[PDB]
Symmetry: C4
Subunit: 341 residues, 4 copies
């Protein structure tokens, strides 16, 4: 049995640097045809991304994926609100269902830029045939297929015609897939394995779920992922759907998995939980902290571009004792940091 690692298992080693954090470029190719100015995407979840999130993401240089837990017409409307807010980029998740192409037609007429054929188990007959049929009707349409965790999945989805694949089985902060079904692979080893296959095929991969800190994004990108998708980092922002609740003098936002009971009900066996996270203000202040943390990581590693970061990044594995050293330790913190807990 081989050991697989997540982000908190590894640290990136400093390289010689001639660049400073404000000198590096975060541009990335989400697909051959879609370039993003920062490597960040908001999750296609009903407590993270609707048109208001998708607009602010796009203005920051990333992209949002409008969730599909709504009627076909309303999702087309959401996409429409983004595209009419100054020609920004927009995505939209699609499902393996009988009405699948009826939903695609709608958001395609609303000029969506990318579709995410998004399922619990992406390495499947449904998703492979779905990609083919979507490409049959819309050959120009950019397709992201997921979710997967193995290089074999990258191959089979690349052959179905996906323009991009999304890596992540069970890392999500609100996910119980690993509890309920016992299936997953630790996210850093997942992205590393699939990214290396992605680059042999010329197909990019997205690191999706399990990211908590800007440093976790740096590890994902250094592992070969074109981009990072978050729910929990963005769920607490004002632009995410759902009002703020105040509890014990602090303010929180509802955040829940799309396999949770609340989400699915808009019996069954959930693969996600429903809870609340701390309110973080506007999306612009979160994005800034993440971007700054990413540029800081790339500086330590001497990388002026994302591709140079990936070709020169060395990881080391840290134990549970290294873990404690790598977070603030042996101190009573009195003031919360803007980029730490």
């Amino acid at each position: 049995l081989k050991t697989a690692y997540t982000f908190d298992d590894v640290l990136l080693v400093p390289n010689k640097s001639e660049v400073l954090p404000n000198e590096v470029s975060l541009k990335t190719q989400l697909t051959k045809k879609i370039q993003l100015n920062i490597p960040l995407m908001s999750a296609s979840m009903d407590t993270v991304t609707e048109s208001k999130m998708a607009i602010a993401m796009a203005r920051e240089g990333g992209i949002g994926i409008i969730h599909k837990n709504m009627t076909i017409e309303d999702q087309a409307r959401e996409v429409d609100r983004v595209k009419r807010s100054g020609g920004l980029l927009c995505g939209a998740s699609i499902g393996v269902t009988n009405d699948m192409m009826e939903r695609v037609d709608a958001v395609v007429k609303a000029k969506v830029d990318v579709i995410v054929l998004d399922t619990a188990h992406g390495h499947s007959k449904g998703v492979i045939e779905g990609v083919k049929r979507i490409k049959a009707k819309y050959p120009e349409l950019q397709v992201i297929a997921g979710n997967i965790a193995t290089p074999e999945a990258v191959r089979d989805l690349a052959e179905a015609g996906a323009d991009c694949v999304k890596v992540g089985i069970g890392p999500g902060s609100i996910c119980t897939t690993r509890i309920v079904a016992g299936v997953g692979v630790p996210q850093l080893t997942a992205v590393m394995d699939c990214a290396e296959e992605g680059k042999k095929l010329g197909i990019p991969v997205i690191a999706d779920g399990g990211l908590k800190y800007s440093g976790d994004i740096v590890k994902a990108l250094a592992a070969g992922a074109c981009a990072a998708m978050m729910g929990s980092i963005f769920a607490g922002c004002e632009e995410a759907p759902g009002a703020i609740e105040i509890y014990q003098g602090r303010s929180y936002k509802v955040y829940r998995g799309m396999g949770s009971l609340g989400a699915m009900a808009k019996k069954f066996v959930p693969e996600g939980v429903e809870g609340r996270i701390a309110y973080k203000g506007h999306l612009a202040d979160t994005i800034y902290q993440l971007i700054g943390g990413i540029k800081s990581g790339m500086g330590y590693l001497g990388a002026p571009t994302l591709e140079n970061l990936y070709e020169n990044a060395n990881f080391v594995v840290q134990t549970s004792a290294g873990f404690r050293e790598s977070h603030p330790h042996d101190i009573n913190i009195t003031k919360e940091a803007p980029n730490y807990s």
Copy 2:
């Protein structure tokens, strides 16, 4: 030092290419060569888990229950008979290595029990080996499960005495202090694996008994090669289990104790503890969650049958960091999930 040994929380199953949905998979399993179950679940023989009402309900769901032996021989026969009357359902019976062993066996077979479980603390022992041979001598066709053991040597030796099936588990029990008190045991996932591996070479099933907390654990135990999975904790809060409801801060709990605890054996030197657990309601509802979870994991792994799940399962070890990613994290869960906590 032999080697490192893993339990359920140490490992994850790797997704496979899949052409089958969770609702397409079959859960049928051979408990012995003569006894098929529609689903691979067993309720433990404990005085707070399985009497006739629980073995009736387990049987209705396609499983089986083992009526505990902490009662007179007469009452145990009644309980079996109470089960068989209710539509010819399948029933099991716990026998111990005692003086009245044949007397107890005599009565449970008169009530037409389908399988007996000759189980002791240390099943790899002259007592059990000789016990099996003696039972099989007087009742050759009667199905006999022997346990508990944790080594392939034990599997081979129990097989050569005549056991129709062997039960794996020394110390994983949620109420168990054997490993604390005696320092003895094998992490349950490594034991089932090494034991199933030997057991399959001999044509003898092994049962994963003890230590199961969630449905994903059952999937791990079956991917490892168990023909079935035996639970105490998961069933012991259900309506059909014996024991009084106590209310603590407006919530309903239910007694659950080890058979080697003080209360059960009633100086003594116990090897279990005694306590309370959240009342879960009807068994059928708990079984529904566990069953959904198993079908979900088998769909993730492309396996339409348990045997195909065993042949194509790939485990990866996760660190304690992988472990924190593999549970909901960085959220205050506000709603209760039917399959998590």
Copy 3:
């Protein structure tokens, strides 16, 4: 590379079951503390002033074990304590001795009091002082049984065996009240230390004592399977009524004071190597001993061992991770009744 050996303590490992022809009540817990000194059970009470004086050493001896009277008292007082134990039936008794100018005056007085065995006990047993101490004790008192410690390496076992040690005490820093690893950065995880010292002890024919870091009876079984001839405990015995010290009330419960011999309080410009605290009152020693003995016999039955020696020759260990540890203790239950061997 300087870092290649991983070392394990008791919670890292589990004993694998063996085929068994023995039941728990059939096993023999007898063991040779030294060639001259047999014990009926392999338990010793620590030479600490919150653990062992005459009252604790008397009670340990009646149960088949032995206590070591601590040396934080005047020479005359330690000899009275020894005499007290020895006068009450000829029970076994040990006593502690340090590397000091008056070392032999202390050894004289406990020998006049009929002590069966002395422990030349220092923080660093693998030292010129302790090596020459044994030599000088054996020259004045050749028949005197001498345990030397504490140590943690096979080289330590050999050198002290060659000084005259009849038995070697192993444990650098596993103590529940010990800060040696904290303060100095020095130690060996206790199960690997015992394994490695026992193995060298066996080649030379000198027994070794697993000293410190035992919590539950299962740990003692691992100590014995690893080769130790006997096991020494402060924490497990310190709550008992026979342990010296006051009853403090905290959160409405009764505790008894327990502290390192290297702590500030025990030593009364000090740099201590242990702390001072309280553990919950356990009642009398007979209860605690009884559960320990019950647990050791249980594990020997799981391993088919009728003697401590047979347990050592046939014990296989398996390493468990921090997730295995979680499974190896009770889990997912609000325990509602007090267990006599688990808290």
Copy 4:
């Protein structure tokens, strides 16, 4: 792409050695360079909550050295240096950053007779630091230059070639540090020290083990790894001589402590790499040093090491697990008394 498992201090223990020397026999003497001898191998961190003139004077009088922090006007820091230089020719240091005004800061601490500058930066393996050392050594050939912070042998070899007299190792281990969280970058501090020390020995360059030390034992491990000295902020920030307000929380008095990369420090937007907090007030620096020195002498005593060079040459390391980590700290006891060297 995973190179190796890397270790920090709590991952390891030093194995005892045969010893002919007691703790009060060992020498703690060391040197930053041949020109900068220290009676003990300890330096207080250059942080605005750790080392101004008061702390440098007292560090100097205990045989260590203080690095006056640079979060102040060039004039003020030279004044602070001049203040410790006049208190009996005590040794002094001063931290310099890679800024536009950096040569005038060097000029001004040089005129004040400072003994060593620390060109201190977030990422020391950089063209900026490399060029900085060259510029400093070209104008002041005799000035002792420490350069950091770094974590790799390659960085050692580069800074050595720039002209650095001493290299400072530590990316991420700081108690107040979030670099590893926000940027994902760092190297567990024991492996970093060990690899950088070994590269520094091939080149004749000494390395300083900076950050992540919590107990006196951690320092022993760093010196045995080959560091010539150890730098600490958390351990000294609680002392009376440290700058910083006293806060009170549940019966204890605290001192403010914060990373130089936190929000408060940088305010003399921002993406911080450190946090702002508080540390238990410890009283006078003399008592903290006494416990640190005594703990270090204790560990060298255990390793049979009469000097730091002998400590480094004979130190064997062993890896403990999380289970072993729980054994290496006081366990299973309600600790009722403060220990002067353990909290």
